[PDB]
Amino acid sequence: LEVPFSARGDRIPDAVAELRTREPIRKVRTITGAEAWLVSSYALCTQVLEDRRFSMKETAAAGAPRLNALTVPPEVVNNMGNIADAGLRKAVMKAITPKAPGLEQFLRDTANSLLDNLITEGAPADLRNDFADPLATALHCKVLGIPQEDGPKLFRSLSIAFMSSADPIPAAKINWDRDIEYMAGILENPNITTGLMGELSRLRKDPAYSHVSDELFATIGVTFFGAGVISTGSFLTTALISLIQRPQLRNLLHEKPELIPAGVEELLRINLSFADGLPRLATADIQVGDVLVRKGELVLVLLEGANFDPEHFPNPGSIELDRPNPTSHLAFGRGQHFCPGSALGRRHAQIGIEALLKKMPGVDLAVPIDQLVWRTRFQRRIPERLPVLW
Ligand code: HEM
Ligand SMILES: Nc1cccc(-c2cc(-c3c(-c4ccc(O)cc4)n[nH]c3N)ccc2O)c1
Ligand SMILES: Nc1cccc(-c2cc(-c3c(-c4ccc(O)cc4)n[nH]c3N)ccc2O)c1
């Protein structure tokens, strides 16, 4: 049994439910040919993510079994850990909340501006390349304090940076080195005084951060831009497809926009944007279900396994806005490495959806759904284009 099962992100394979039933932890083979334990039940997914003995940091260890080839320097795997040790965690998290003044208004204006141009241009429109991704890019430029016109350049690295490859990718290092050099220049730029890079540039000259390397400062910039843009852009794209497939829900959210956060939360739960399970390495012998995971073995946490688990989410395929456990999904992960951009991710989706439902209430696919081209061997499930009419 080889993972991943399908690059299609518009429907979950029937095999996932069967697997969760029969073998909630199963030996699979990754694209690199390595063994791994695939966990697909909510209970066991939660257990793994809340046990730090299943380590993220150690997934980059030498000779360790691999989900896929590294496309970043080995130390980037422990990036949030290095941020914490350098005493920068509070500052970073503050810089990436949607609660920043003028941020939500910027998202709203940007989303409306993008949609107005699509309408002016006329159907069909590509909701990924000309809405979801540009909105994600524009947002993270604003969050970092870097020029808007620098966005598309940094975005270009992402079709390679987030590949899920069996072998090392020569272009990944080339792009990484280039983007690092860009962020280093930003730190030296006196004009950059706002956002994440503005604050980092400030802390860089502060005595209490004298021994925090310039490497880490630039790395934070590159990492948060790439991870944030790819995650919010891809999720919003696949969420829009979920809405298109659900006219009844669309109208309801259109009619009662206060329900949109609860809707986005359900869209998060059923979202299939993650193409691979979350990788962890066992730093000890740990019992997981019917399996004793040995030290040094690779464990993959299948997010849709847990999120479509009927034992935790009854009628998992249905979007229900009144669930008693609405945010208990694992779309933002769980435990030590819970997504620091979760609130920003929610707000990006909510504002993008609200604007679209206002501007395009009759939005629908301009092509048969099977005509969507799903990107292969990639860390996200996305259609190359999302053609719509309205
Ligand atoms: C819909 C949007 C997003 C989704 C679904 C998402 C999903 C996730 C998930 C599942 C994890 C856990 C990874 C693991 O445990 O191995 C994670 C971690 C992380 N996310 Fe997000 N994310 C989103 C947006 C963002 C944004 C906007 C940012 C930054 C601006 C961001 C930055 C990070 C970072 C730095 C980590 C690593 C945390 C750690 O290692 O402790 N993400 N994200
Ligand atoms: N595969 C890949 C993808 C993306 C980035 C990088 C990358 C890694 C390093 C690095 C090395 C390193 C540098 C060159 C080399 O021949 C072997 C190891 N040792 N320690 C660190 N941090 C430095 C800059 C880079 O751009 C590599
Ligand atoms: N939102 C979210 C959810 C889950 C993982 C992450 C995440 C992913 C990477 C990463 C990259 C990567 C990231 C940024 C970049 O400019 C180039 C390459 N390539 N391959 C991987 N794994 C690095 C740090 C991260 O925090 C982010």
From TrEMBL:
Keyword Protease (UniProt): no
Cofactor annotation: heme
Any one GO cellular component localisation term in the record: cytoplasm
Pfam families, per database record: p450
MF-aspect GO terms: heme binding; iron ion binding; monooxygenase activity; oxidoreductase activity, acting on paired donors, with incorporation or reduction of molecular oxygen
PROSITE patterns found in the cross-reference section: CYTOCHROME_P450 (PS00086)
InterPro entries membership: Cyt_P450, Cyt_P450_B, Cyt_P450_CS, Cyt_P450_sf
Main localization, broad class: cytoplasm
Subcellular location: Cytoplasm
Keyword Metal-binding listed: yes
Keywords: Cytoplasm, Heme, Iron, Metal-binding, Monooxygenase, Oxidoreductase
Family, per entry: Belongs to the cytochrome P450 family.
Name of the protein this chain belongs to: Cytochrome P450 MT2
Species per Swiss-Prot/TrEMBL record: Mycobacterium tuberculosis
Gene field: cyp121
